[PDB]
């Protein structure tokens, strides 16, 4: 049947009244109401800007929207697929089994993308945008998105989607008249890492994380593709390495899948970012080869941080010659990527010391067994691996890794240098390693797991009682961990963050729970940097969890419905 | 491609190892060497009776499977539709996009039932269930389960379904040649609590989860349509409470999809129980009656548990001809269930002091607003609800209440009597109260909130950090959680168990990881109530994981597939 209700703004808030048929006053629906009762409107991530909303709607006939593409160029099958894709972005503000009524203005979408031959991923690619909403003659609208680059047009694009509100009172598809907005992002790297060698992740549910991660102008998906439990990375060169790594013979990633889903980010402004970490978290895969140590190894508790233990041995010349082959591989499918990722995860020393052959190699090279010594391996290691990193990617290119041993800020430069070598951080926003390292000049990605480790909370996947990094972490958590806060002045240093998806205890069923809505925050946070906390961010929090479940995405529930409809009073 | 690998039972964990060529001994696939290499191989929950799986497998055609009814009676329609159901179960040995071969031998299914006209539910029904399958001729199988009802009947075949093994090795489905399984559970109510007023669930979720249920033979589905929240529950004689009261027009449960959802219980064992809390837990919906105080009350903090505040007025009278309306709405919908749930949820004290009506009304029954006197006004509404109950179904039947002020052993007797009413425990195991309840003869349905709230440990709805009842419990917690030891002497009076999902943070898109797989453990704990503690059972349950996964069941992830398939390298 009918809507019964209406809403009105007062003091910030949409309030819920009874529609009344003895009024004078047009009656708001609630999407209508927040619109404009809200700072923001329904807007996520918010503009950094021009953030002009204007104080009126028009109505839309939802069969009358037609893009146009101003400038042709070398991304024209980019922005056509882009633009072939907004009208089911606008049919999101459409609530499932509704139908809007085919009437009111036609909407001329106009795409303007100033360099149309760039397509390129990079740390200083061109993310902003322009947007301009205005009435055109009587019985049309004049949406123009100006952009320098594919990537902040297709941005323009999911932003002029979210000023699109459904009337369920009425049936009508609206639309806000009057829009000024200009938009550009804080931070350049702003990312989710998915864990597919704990448990598999099909590839329909990665591309169906793009397409929640552009929804919100998330760029980077980090595919912790291999760990010590799998190897279901597809090899050509060395097929053994999947053949006996793969959980099964069907959960694998193909050239072919992985193609697909770099051309599904690509379309998505999404760089899809391959990690091979190394020397530990190897495992399956390896067996035979006689190129890793501890594989298995019990007890496990005294050689590594989880099950199984294994570890690759950088005293095997052959070893690198396997490297060779699988970031060769990586490097042919993987071809949008500016980025590698090297892992460098922390690794065991009494693993290390525990081979005969690694023994053995440490005496003829004067290095003994107490722990500097395991150090120069690891770095004797990395320096080797690096090399077969550059050769099969065919140029010199940026390489992350892991804040660790190895990456400690008082050496890090006998080792790396900060040119080279970008670090991922783990560590807490209150750990002197990232003032350390900021003062070297290093750059950073920020994944603080007190913050953006997504995994935290559950069951004990060993034993009992909770995991380790529990508890559970808030959107409100993620949402204040501010980088800005975190770096001060060496702010430009960092190029953004990082949602951190392990998955021990995650994989195709659990996806869209993790990382959604949660992901989100990370997403404002990143492309905003607000000074505000996220009480004022609430609002838009609660509808922007709604339209990801409109998208068919089965986000975690922040609140009971009720309080979306009656902002204000669910508070603490 | 093809599996590489094989698997061999050793101390009771199967070892993954090479295939290798040159052997003369047939490899043993991953769920094949489970079936034997464990105590109860794939079943869940594990029998209480004769468990006797034998020794060896035999090639079954997926279509040679013929189910035969020998006795025929009043459940012809439902055994019908239980049979049909049978090969749907048997096709979830095999992996979605794998194909068995379509050789080997036939299967006969002889259902056996001893009373073929029963088909009520009740706390005497009988559930027991008797399984043989053993060798048939020499091309075929002789499975016959015998049982005293309809419900031990389906039961039978649910853990018949599972003693079939999908061989991907070789694309064989097989199954147990040798069978003697006797069965029964130890108590007989075994339950999931549904809030879905909290937030809306569809229709469909709602199914898929009694099909979860069935799975593992919990036979309860306790539906808390209402709350303060909204009002979804369609009620004819009073369409105001839901037109004012649902959260949208389409987010309703109609007399057509309870009837729907009841029948599809019926078939699978689940007796379905509504729940109409009273005299607290209500709001919305209620609107222009006068019938409510407190609805919205601010601040909230000092009128309720959580916003938004409202309760019953028991002092008009009009009050009861809503309440008789409300409940025989109810019990037209609900015509399988054999007891009602009148929640009796934490009234407020503070709340009912605040009206004047009620304050008039208390001076002039010589009643103080000491707090004795509020005691007796929710004693005063509950004896006239309970009159109301009894009317809308027609009989006395055994109702429901929580643990609370009113139902503290220690004045419960003024009030209640313990063959009318059965109180539901959310208190810890170890609480008083239980103690003083079984003592007095009362029967109690367990849902303790430390073991049992599967809502526990996400973030903060109000403000910031973790909600109320963190940590999350693992599956672990559920399973150890014994009632028989919470009781002793005093058992026989535990009716058994219900996890309790509210639905703050829950909905449709959350469903299947808030109840999967934890309720299972909760269905072996109430089914058997072993003596053995959940290491005993970590195997098990993780192969019902996969199971609910193959069912189409969003399961949460418990540990890394690698665990599953390296029984013992995983522990701590």
């Given at each position: 049947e009918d809507v019964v209700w209406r809403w009105s703004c007062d003091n910030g808030k949409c309030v819920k009244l009874k529609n009344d048929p003895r009024s004078?006053?047009?009656?708001?629906?609630?999407?209508?109401?927040?619109?404009?009762?809200?700072?923001?409107?329904?807007?996520?991530?918010?503009?950094?800007?021009?953030?002009?909303?204007?104080?009126?709607?028009?109505?839309?006939?939802?069969?009358?929207?037609?893009?146009?593409?101003?400038?042709?160029?070398?991304?024209?099958?980019?922005?056509?697929?882009?633009?072939?894709?907004?009208?089911?972005?606008?049919?999101?503000?459409?609530?499932?089994?509704?139908?809007?009524?085919?009437?009111?203005?036609?909407?001329?979408?106009?795409?303007?993308?100033?360099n149309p031959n760039e397509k390129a991923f990079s740390l200083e690619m061109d993310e902003s945008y322009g947007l301009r909403v205005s009435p055109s003659?009587?019985?049309?609208?004049?949406?123009?998105?100006?952009?320098?680059?594919?990537?902040?047009?297709?941005?323009?694009?999911?932003?002029?989607?979210?000023?699109?509100?459904?009337?369920?009172?009425?049936?009508?598809?609206?639309?806000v008249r009057d829009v000024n907005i200009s938009d550009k992002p804080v931070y350049p790297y702003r990312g989710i890492l998915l864990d597919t060698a704990r448990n598999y992740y099909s590839i329909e549910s990665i591309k169906r994380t793009?397409?929640?991660?552009?929804?919100?102008?998330?760029?980077?998906?980090?595919?912790?593709?291999?760990?010590?439990?799998?190897?279901?990375?597809?090899?050509?060169?060395r097929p053994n390495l999947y053949k006996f790594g793969?959980?099964?013979?069907?959960?694998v990633y193909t050239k072919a899948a992985i193609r697909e889903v770099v051309r599904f980010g690509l379309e998505r402004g999404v760089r899809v970012l391959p990690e091979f970490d190394a020397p530990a978290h190897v495992?399956?895969?390896?067996?035979?080869?006689?190129?890793?140590?501890?594989?298995?190894?019990?007890?496990?508790?005294?050689?590594?941080?989880?099950?199984?233990?294994?570890?690759?041995?950088?005293?095997?010349?052959e070893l690198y010659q396997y490297l060779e082959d699988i970031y060769s591989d990586?490097?042919?499918?993987?071809?949008?990527?500016?980025?590698?990722?090297?892992?460098?995860?922390?690794?065991?020393?009494?693993?290390?010391?525990?081979?005969?052959?690694?023994?053995?190699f440490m005496m003829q090279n004067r290095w003994d067994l107490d722990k500097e010594s395991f150090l120069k391996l690891w770095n004797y290691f990395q320096q080797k691996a690096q090399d077969k990193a550059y050769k099969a990617f065919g140029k010199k290119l940026p390489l992350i890794?892991?804040?660790?041993?190895?990456?400690?800020?008082?050496?890090?430069?006998?080792?790396?240098?900060?040119?080279?070598?970008?670090?991922?951080?783990?560590?807490?926003?209150?750990?002197?390693?990232?003032?350390?390292?900021?003062?070297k000049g290093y750059r950073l990605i920020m994944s603080n797991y007190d913050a953006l480790y997504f995994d935290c909370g559950y069951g004990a996947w060993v034993g009992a009682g909770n995991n380790w990094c529990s508890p559970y972490i808030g959107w409100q958590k993620v949402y204040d961990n501010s980088p800005?806060?975190?770096?001060?002045?060496?702010?430009?240093?960092?190029?953004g963050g990082e949602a951190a998806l392990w998955s021990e205890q995650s994989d195709t069923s659990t996806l869209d729970g993790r990382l959604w809505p949660r992901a989100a925050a990370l997403a404002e946070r990143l492309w905003a940097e607000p000074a505000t906390s996220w009480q004022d961010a609430e609002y838009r929090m609660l509808h922007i969890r709604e339209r990801l479940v409109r998208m068919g995405i089965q986000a975690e529930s922040l609140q009971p419905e009720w309080c979306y409809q009656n902002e204000g009073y669910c508070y603490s």
């Amino acid at each position: 049947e009918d809507v019964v209700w209406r809403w009105s703004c007062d003091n910030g808030k949409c309030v819920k009244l009874k529609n009344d048929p003895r009024s004078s006053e047009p009656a708001l629906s609630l999407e209508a109401c927040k619109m404009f009762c809200n700072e923001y409107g329904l807007l996520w991530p918010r503009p950094t800007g021009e953030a002009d909303l204007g104080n009126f709607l028009s109505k839309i006939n939802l069969n009358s929207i037609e893009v146009k593409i101003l400038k042709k160029g070398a991304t024209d099958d980019l922005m056509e697929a882009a633009a072939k894709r907004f009208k089911e972005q606008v049919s999101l503000a459409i609530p499932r089994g509704s139908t809007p009524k085919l009437t009111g203005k036609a909407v001329d979408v106009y795409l303007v993308n100033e360099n149309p031959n760039e397509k390129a991923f990079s740390l200083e690619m061109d993310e902003s945008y322009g947007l301009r909403v205005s009435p055109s003659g009587a019985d049309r609208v004049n949406a123009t998105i100006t952009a320098n680059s594919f990537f902040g047009m297709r941005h323009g694009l999911e932003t002029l989607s979210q000023l699109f509100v459904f009337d369920d009172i009425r049936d009508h598809l609206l639309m806000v008249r009057d829009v000024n907005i200009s938009d550009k992002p804080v931070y350049p790297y702003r990312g989710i890492l998915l864990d597919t060698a704990r448990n598999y992740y099909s590839i329909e549910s990665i591309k169906r994380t793009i397409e929640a991660m552009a929804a919100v102008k998330l760029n980077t998906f980090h595919w912790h593709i291999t760990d010590s439990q799998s190897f279901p990375f597809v090899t050509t060169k060395r097929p053994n390495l999947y053949k006996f790594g793969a959980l099964s013979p069907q959960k694998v990633y193909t050239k072919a899948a992985i193609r697909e889903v770099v051309r599904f980010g690509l379309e998505r402004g999404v760089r899809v970012l391959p990690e091979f970490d190394a020397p530990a978290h190897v495992g399956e895969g390896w067996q035979d080869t006689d190129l890793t140590v501890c594989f298995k190894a019990e007890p496990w508790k005294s050689y590594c941080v989880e099950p199984p233990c294994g570890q690759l041995n950088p005293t095997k010349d052959e070893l690198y010659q396997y490297l060779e082959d699988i970031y060769s591989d990586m490097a042919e499918v993987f071809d949008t990527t500016d980025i590698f990722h090297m892992g460098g995860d922390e690794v065991s020393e009494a693993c290390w010391n525990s081979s005969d052959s690694i023994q053995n190699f440490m005496m003829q090279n004067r290095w003994d067994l107490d722990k500097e010594s395991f150090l120069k391996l690891w770095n004797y290691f990395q320096q080797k691996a690096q090399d077969k990193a550059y050769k099969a990617f065919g140029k010199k290119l940026p390489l992350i890794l892991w804040t660790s041993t190895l990456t400690n800020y008082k050496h890090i430069d006998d080792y790396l240098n900060k040119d080279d070598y970008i670090i991922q951080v783990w560590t807490t926003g209150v750990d002197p390693q990232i003032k350390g390292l900021l003062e070297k000049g290093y750059r950073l990605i920020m994944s603080n797991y007190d913050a953006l480790y997504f995994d935290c909370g559950y069951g004990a996947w060993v034993g009992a009682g909770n995991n380790w990094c529990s508890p559970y972490i808030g959107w409100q958590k993620v949402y204040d961990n501010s980088p800005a806060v975190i770096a001060l002045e060496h702010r430009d240093q960092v190029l953004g963050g990082e949602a951190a998806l392990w998955s021990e205890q995650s994989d195709t069923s659990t996806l869209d729970g993790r990382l959604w809505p949660r992901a989100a925050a990370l997403a404002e946070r990143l492309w905003a940097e607000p000074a505000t906390s996220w009480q004022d961010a609430e609002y838009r929090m609660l509808h922007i969890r709604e339209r990801l479940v409109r998208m068919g995405i089965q986000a975690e529930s922040l609140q009971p419905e009720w309080c979306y409809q009656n902002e204000g009073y669910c508070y603490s």
